[PDB]
Amino acid sequence: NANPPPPETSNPNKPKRQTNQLQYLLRVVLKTLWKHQFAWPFQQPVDAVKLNLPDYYKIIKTPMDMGTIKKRLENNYYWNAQECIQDFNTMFTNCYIYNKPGDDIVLMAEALEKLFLQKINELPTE
Numbered sequence: 001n002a003n004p005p006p007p008e009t010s011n012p013n014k015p016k017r018q019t020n021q022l023q024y025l026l027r028v029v030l031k032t033l034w035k036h037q038f039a040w041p042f043q044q045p046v047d048a049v050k051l052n053l054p055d056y057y058k059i060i061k062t063p064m065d066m067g068t069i070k071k072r073l074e075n076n077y078y079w080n081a082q083e084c085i086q087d088f089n090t091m092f093t094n095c096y097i098y099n100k101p102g103d104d105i106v107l108m109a110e111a112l113e114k115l116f117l118q119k120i121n122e123l124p125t126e
């Protein structure tokens with residue numbers, strides 16, 4: 001069972017805009033979560049071949065990771081801030097869906113989600 005390709009991260013046909021909200025998502029939210037001690041498993045797609053998890057992509061049909069989110073922001077892939085926020089939410093919930101409650105990786109994602117919510121609290125107005 002091969003890994004799927006990573007989510008798309010750049011599309012020259014998508015329109016581009018700079019907004020206060022998207023700038024904040026890259027410069028504050030993503031940068032803060034990226035440097036966190038628990039960020040490392042989330043910095044690239046789950047490599048289920050390397051990890052011998054043949055049911056990962058049978059269970060998780062909407063993968064997402066922070067490496068993808070970073071690339072999407074840098075490539076002006078998102079038009080609405082909510083698209084980015086949804087991707088963060090998908091990342092965290094994928095981790096809760098697949099892994100056992102109480103596992104280290106779950107507590108890691110929970111800490112990262114709490115930080116994310118503290119950072120999103122101060123998102124600029126639309």
Ligand SMILES: CNC(=O)c1cccc(-c2ccc3c(c2)N(C(=O)c2ccco2)C[C@H](C)N3C(C)=O)c1
Pocket residue numbers: 040041042046047051053056094095098099104105
């Ligand atoms: C560059 N490679 C890595 O950063 C890397 C190396 C070894 C393992 C991992 C890793 C990546 C993703 C995950 C886990 C481990 N997982 C772990 O259980 C785990 C335990 C402790 C840290 O990660 C399995 C699970 C599928 N998972 C997530 C994000 O849900 C990532």
